[PDB]
Design a protein around this ligand. Structure first.
Ligand code: HEM
Ligand code: HEM
Ligand code: JSS
Ligand code: JSS
Ligand code: H4B
Ligand code: H4B
Ligand code: ZN
Lengths: 407, 411
């Protein structure tokens, strides 16, 4: 019922009680661990609403106060007659901040309480959505001094009137299959790129073409829009010691902004809730640049470093990985664009985890995702036992809209 | 019910049915994943079904399920359980048992090799000196002058839990750790407690950074006694770097034979509490963990110092730069001295081929991602991108409490 987590580098032991709150299911059983799987009515809504308002009023030190009870009845009455309900601004902000706080896969949660929340619940059209997104992008970008933000479109109703951003992130590079059999640009985005092409985008067909936004308001067919190029802060990638690195022609965007997740607060479902912070270096240098199924540049870089690629045991992939990552961090720093290295990020998360254990009685954490994709064991999170469980408010994955949406 | 796992690099999707044979529990529930927690006298009653399951598996694999020899063996085991409270494994069942415990070890990346395991039957052993002799033979056989061979030696099973055979060392070969009065540690800080115990048992400690510990060996529930492994039996590799000539002056070395001696081997309900086993190293175990963990030799600072890296900001990735160089040095040193070692690229590619093979021929391969993914360069190894299902099959190796915590001292 109570559970201990040990850090095997420091011997520091923490006791978790927060897990006894969790309701949603992990995918694991007593018989099987699914820890490494990427994806494992009116009557439904009121317990959900109640459970959320209870944690809200307890957080503002007013649990069981008349103002608490009154709000419970007003929501109960609104559900009974409207089959849904509306969140107060204060509840919206709290819900969003807590969905981030509860994101067990996110290493950057030390920052959870400083999230700028933009309420776009009054939005009605895709042109409206575009305006809100551009304002979000400009606000978060802040000329390189990045700030966390989320923008929240109207909640689901009958599920036939969904707001969706079809893009997976607000800013991403296009992907084309070429006659060659090779891929130009980002292979992750090939399918979405074609969907933009069949919707009518003129594609420049380069390595680093910023995709257009494809915006669905109120269940209607989605619409193309190009983000003013002047709102998209990008960094050219160079190396502090290797002069040849510039000729690889590498660039990345400053703003990571996930736009395909669903935000659930008090049983209400916000299907379009783009949010953004800033990069940890490895996301770009390890995953985007080096995954065999992404830009996959390890082979090209190793060649320029004149390393022995004859045998895997020369650790040439590993040498090139480090240098690719040094260059990402150097480039973002030199251009004054916020970025965090994996040493700094994981050390912060350990500090945050200790805060959450003393202040909240726990911190749900998914070790498979929190440990960086390079140098795992020289980061302190490697040695940290973590407990993974699902709390609400939360961000969840949802089906790609094109599989779903009817034209 | 069939369970699917997907490789996110290749889109290969595999179907697991083997998890259906899984008996033991994971630590996890529908409400909590304990996937990163390091650790989350049997009676006649419980013993017969365990013996029966095991023998059903054995007889299946040799294609004799339901045979008169299968039925006769069940009845003979049954009769022996009721009459004596335990039973004895045939040699063939012991071999099969030991190979399967390795096959089932979900935290082990080296399993492609599971079927080539030299089993030494030491169930006729009775004394600590007998144990020492069996262990020297294992070490010489396994070492094979650098062309390492996988092996396990199996001492007598638990009886009443008062007569246990235990190897008190956690590996057959490991270096002492000495905690100094100024709070520094000389040698391997992981072995401080055990070293203290050796010392108190009368070991005279050289007190260097690389003193090979003595063996502390318990037979038949008796008090353990000290033995020194003959030095000529302990193959060691001095560590140098192919390009950096100052690397050798760090004074590093490591032993070639990794030989886990503190686990419990369970087969058909029987408990083998001393069953040391050994293979060969994957380079990262030494280069990443043993050398670079902050709680271990911790040489990152001193290495990066000698590499003249920028150390005033973590964002120069100086730690990462030094880590790779150390790992290069380890592999180079082993290869140069013709001592078997495997790099993490090669080992993980092998594991993936093993795992796909196992799904096809066996209907699954239990695997613990937290453990299989190497402690450096995770995502450029194909395992990182592999979904895995973790569950407990028997035969199995299990953790057991350190014997100094449980042992009843006789005097
Ligand atoms: C501010 C600096 C931040 C950093 C350094 C950061 C870091 C990360 C990283 C490295 C991941 C792993 C994702 C992957 O590898 O694909 C992640 C996941 C995630 N983060 Fe953050 N984060 C930040 C801000 C935010 C904010 C503002 C939110 C929401 C308000 C958020 C919510 C999430 C969620 C929901 C996931 C899981 C995505 C998934 O399951 O695929 N993060 N975070
Ligand atoms: C042939 C060469 C082998 C290689 C390269 C190899 C590789 C490894 C590695 C890297 C680990 C993780 C250890 C750690 O980081 O703490 C491990 C764990 C393990 N291996 Fe192997 N292995 C080999 C052979 C064997 C053999 C012969 C056995 C026994 C028959 C064995 C059984 C195990 C077990 C039971 C674990 C789990 C240890 C634990 O939970 O602490 N392996 N293997
Ligand atoms: C807000 C924020 C800040 C930050 N630094 N980093 C992030 C994660 C972003 C960026 N870097 C990856 C992306 O993570 C979000 C995408 N999650 C992948 C899960 C997935 C499941 C199934 C199929 C797939 F192809 C992918 C968010
Ligand atoms: C047979 C074989 C071959 C090989 N290459 N590698 C191995 C694992 C060895 C080597 N390198 C580490 C050790 O693994 C065995 C010890 N396992 C640690 C688990 C643990 C539990 C509780 C507390 C702890 F601090 C640690 C075995
Ligand atoms: C199969 C495995 O679960 C998958 O590759 C995961 C592993 N850990 C991860 N960790 C992070 N931060 N991001 C990812 O995309 C993944 N992928
Ligand atoms: C807390 C965490 O599970 C622990 O540090 C584990 C992580 N993965 C590991 N993986 C291997 N192979 N060996 C280890 O010792 C560990 N340590
Ligand atoms: Zn689990």
């Amino acid at each position: 019922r109570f559970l201990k987590v040990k850090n095997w580098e420091t011997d520091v032991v923490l006791t978790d009680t927060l897990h006894l709150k969790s309701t949603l299911e992990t995918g694991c059983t007593e018989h099987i661990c699914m820890g490494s799987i990427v994806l494992p009515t009116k009557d439904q809504l009121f317990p959900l609403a109640k459970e959320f308002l209870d944690q809200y009023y307890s957080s503002i030190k007013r649990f069981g106060s008349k103002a608490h009870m009154d709000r419970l009845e007003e929501v109960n009455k609104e559900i009974e007659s409207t089959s849904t309900y509306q969140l107060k601004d204060t509840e919206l902000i709290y819900g969003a901040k807590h969905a981030w706080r509860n994101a067990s896969r996110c290493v950057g949660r030390i920052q959870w309480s400083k999230l700028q929340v933009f309420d776009a619940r009054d939005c009605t059209t895709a042109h409206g959505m575009f305006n809100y997104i551009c304002n979000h992008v400009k606000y978060a970008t802040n000329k390189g001094n990045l700030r966390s933000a989320i923008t929240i479109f109207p909640q689901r109703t009958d599920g036939k009137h969904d707001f969706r951003v079809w893009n997976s992130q607000l800013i991403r590079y296009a992907g084309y299959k070429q006659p060659d059999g090779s891929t130009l640009g980002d292979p992750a985005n090939v399918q979405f790129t074609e969907i933009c092409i069949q919707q009518g985008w003129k594609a420049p067909r380069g390595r680093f073409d910023v995709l257009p936004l494809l915006l669905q308001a109120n269940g209607n067919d989605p619409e193309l829009f190009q983000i003013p190029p002047e709102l998209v802060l990008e960094v050219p990638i160079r190396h502090p010691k290797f002069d040849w690195f510039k000729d690889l022609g590498l660039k990345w965007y400053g703003l990571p902004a996930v736009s395909n997740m669903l935000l659930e607060i008090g049983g209400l479902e916000f299907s379009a809730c783009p949010f953004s912070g800033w990069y940890m270096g490895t996301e770009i240098g390890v995953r985007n640049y080096c995954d065999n199924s992404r830009y996959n540049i390890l082979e090209e870089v190793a060649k320029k470093m004149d390393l022995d690629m004859r045998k895997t045991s020369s650790l040439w992939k590993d040498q090139a990985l480090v240098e690719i990552n040094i260059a990402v961090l150097y480039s973002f720093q030199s251009d004054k664009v916020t970025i965090v290295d994996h040493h700094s990020a994981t050390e912060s998360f350990i500090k945050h985890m200790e805060n959450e254990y003393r202040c909240r009685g726990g911190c749900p954490a998914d070790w498979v995702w929190i440990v960086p994709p390079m140098s795992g064991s020289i980061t302190p999170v490697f040695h940290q036992e973590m407990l993974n469980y699902r709390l609400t408010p939360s961000f969840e994955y949802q089906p790609d809209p094109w599989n779903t949406h009817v034209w």
